């Protein structure tokens, strides 16, 4: 359960993400496919080549979801009620994969935010991304 | 090139909005369609090895009966009792010609599934690429409508949301395209829209045919197994007479 | 690995399991408790309700072939790595099945055996089957590490 | 999230447990220590021998907690607000262990409720025991 | 498990890590992000706040000895099972550290390296370190 | 035997209720107390066989210098080249005398920790066994108070909850026992009660002493390591002048 202190750190760190949200999401996914290649199976119809525009496109869609989730931190289950169903009933993604993208998102934020990614913030970001995963896995 | 025909009224804008969402949802649709047929192509390597084995066990059950019939060749020549010790070996080789027959089927089905799956992937990427591309052109058309000198069009384009339709099918999309015949037939997208309808229809025709060839392949492996049981129990059967006879003629 | 006293209770209970059906009961239960595993069996037909799943002849059928692998590996406990080697190629490099799912099915089998044997499935025999199913899970996920 | 259908199955299955709550708890724990010996470390000061009264005693305390959790299924986080803190801040139990006891509780219920533990109920009991684990693990950060 | 091109980028980056402190930064980060991990280090003294945890000389100290084990596995990539064998006896037979905790620390190190190197810690080099930390996790949990 | 003295009033019942909860909370308390000292006993064998290898590396650094001083022997006590080997080898054997000294410390501390931990476990078991046995006798006393002819005693025993005090200490328990001097001194539980207070106090005295022997141990392994560095760099120094001839 995200504390008022946890919430402030998320909003502040994703606040610094801002304009680059789309490039980050694309990197998080590219990092995921490379580190955990069995994740690529959910995208057989995608061009997963380096710096693909399909991956650039998907990247923004994943990040804007997260931008919305941050904006609605207090009521996150309703904010992502659409996706929690899409992932559960239509894509049938194994829940163990939500853990993998969540870590690659932290790897992305560590590489790009040298100042703000502090131990206090590292905890609050992982706390949050776990909560986002929990919402998406809620309809299985 | 961009779409030249402008959005005439508030009802026209609403159809284009659902069309931008349908075209977006093509990306999800093909993925969900293609994925099970890829899981079936993954097992073709394993299911072929199972056939080469049922053949190996068959050939070996044939060789165990072929050695058992060689021992009793010079014991009873054209006699009565040994006419039976040759009969099970005949049943054994006939059963193998059925095992060798079904294994040829499994082989052809494996090649058929590979060729079908490799094909369906191209139809799913093809429908996806042409999907995302055309939706861009439609979004730009709505973006212009947000600037339109008409107050009803300006409000309808404004109220209009950037969404993705999750329940897209070849049917639902053609249905959305029917709502705007001017967009449907505009030279900038005309062929791209036609290319999606065909690609989607061929992708379903392939995924179904992969489920089909698999059903035919599994049938052959069961039939090869039935005949391996028939061969082995005919080998071990009159080959039982080979252990009881060590006598001289 | 197992103790000779455990190897004794394990092969005892296993000789009493109805090979024809206990496999489908575990496989069906997996698709019912952990529904996402269904992505792997969309060609099986009707899986919409627990009674449609449990009834499904394809489920009971495939269930028998997966239990047959369990019966195979229960004999060669000293060599599980090689026994499941051919299957490891199918589940890992081909299907790309997450190893936890093997673990989940393993625990589901243990739940089925407890459901069927009752007071015969004692804490120490559960403990031994747990070692077996853990082994069969590792032997299958060998192609990953 | 437990559905009205999931909730009915829990209440019905734990309803059949009844007086045998402190019996099935002692069993679940004894099964856990045997299958996952790593769990015994949180009880260095306990007599973990077969049919111990310490384990029999602890068993009832764990089950009555679960009896309370069933009674308050709609408001489970407040129902177990005491334990979620005890386990998190005082004991410091690794969350991975909550998964292990939860399974041994299902193994216990499968062995004793032949009729009740159906596929429909198996799913609803695991969903519930996961929710109980979630509550207890909620105060670790 | 690593490709000769990966072995090249891995040993490259590792020769640039500040051995003296990157270990304590990972170990401290573990006790801050996953607090239950503190039950093994109750004798470490002050562990109340992230600044009291990061400051702790015992944490930075033990952090250096833990990274030293990583520097050894990163030299002996062909044989990880034997390299960490003595430690497997300590982490599994004696202390019973659940193997996921090794995995958690492994991912935390990857997070620290990304935090330090930045644009130098590219998706393919991350992918290679991931193979390494996964290996070091398995090699330690070998006794299980 | 059971407690013979009956609960006189509503305030007496309330103390017995808390005292029960305190006695119940003794199991939790000892577990939390004993556990870290068990984690420290787990590292003893690793640290001993770590000290054993610092001695082995030391003895080997001594033997590399002892062979290097045997080669340069064919020379007089005048050459700077011949004297630097003999002097570094003296520094090398002196450094070993302290490696050998600290290793004896590590050995004695390992034995001390084992003996302390094995001891503390018995205290923790003894305090829980006695803390839980007596709570039974107190519960039965409250159960009898739920039957009392006093309207106030029957209600106080009824309102009284079956709970477990999570913040139990040797202090808080003695404090709960002071509230009921008639129960505390009753012959049925008197000694069991005294056995908890001592067991708990000795368990804390042991857990703390284990934290102390380990700091005194770790210090010795660091000091054995400092002297191994001092030995090796004096030994490799002697090997520098030995290849020079
Ligand atoms: C951080 C958590 C995640 C978020 C916020 C997220 C977001 C979404 C969104 C917004 C879409 C589709 C929206 C659209 O195109 O209109 C979706 C689609 C998808 N997601 Fe996720 N997702 C997450 C995690 C996952 C994970 C772990 C996987 C599995 C590896 C997954 C695989 C998919 C797939 C296969 C699609 C289908 C889209 C397509 O085929 O074009 N994502 N993602
Ligand atoms: C861990 C214990 C398991 C064992 C012993 C096992 C065994 C096997 C066997 C023997 C087959 C093929 C038999 C045949 O075709 O003749 C196979 C097929 C398969 N297994 Fe597994 N399996 C296990 C778990 C898994 C799990 C957890 C999944 C994931 C859902 C998985 C998914 C599959 C799939 C998708 C097939 C292919 C079905 C087909 O041929 O269409 N199984 N199983
Ligand atoms: C999942 C459901 C669980 C429930 C309902 C539960 C219930 C409880 C309760 C109510 C207590 C306090 C007993 C009292 O008031 O005296 C407690 C104590 C304890 N629990 Fe849990 N628990 C659960 C899981 C866990 C797990 C997984 C572990 C082990 C890793 C854990 C280990 C302990 C320990 C060590 C104690 C202290 C016992 C003592 O020293 O007296 N339990 N349990
Ligand atoms: C995953 C990679 C890990 C490595 C390479 C590693 C390395 C080691 C090393 C080298 C030591 C001995 C240090 C010395 O000589 O004093 C050790 C000790 C220890 N490790 Fe690990 N470790 C790992 C993970 C774990 C984890 C996840 C935990 C639990 C949270 C664990 C808990 C311990 C404990 C309790 C000790 C005893 C240290 C002491 O208190 O003196 N470490 N670590």
UniProtKB/TrEMBL annotation, chain B:
Residues 225-247 have a biased composition (Basic and acidic residues). One of its GO terms (molecular function) is metal ion binding. Keywords: Heme, Iron, Membrane, Metal-binding, Transmembrane, Transmembrane helix. Residues 225-249 are annotated as: Disordered. The chain holds residues 116 to 364 of 387 of the full protein. It comes from Trypanosoma congolense (strain IL3000). Heme b binds at residues 40, 50. This is Uncharacterized protein. It comes from the Eukaryota. Disulfide bonds join 17-160.
UniProtKB/TrEMBL annotation, chain F:
Residues 225-245 have a biased composition (Basic and acidic residues). Disulfide bonds join 17-160. Heme b binds at residues 40, 50. Residues 225-245 are annotated as: Disordered. One of its GO terms (molecular function) is metal ion binding. The keyword Transferase does not apply. Keywords: Heme, Iron, Membrane, Metal-binding, Transmembrane, Transmembrane helix. This is Uncharacterized protein. It comes from Trypanosoma congolense (strain IL3000). The chain holds residues 116 to 360 of 387 of the full protein.
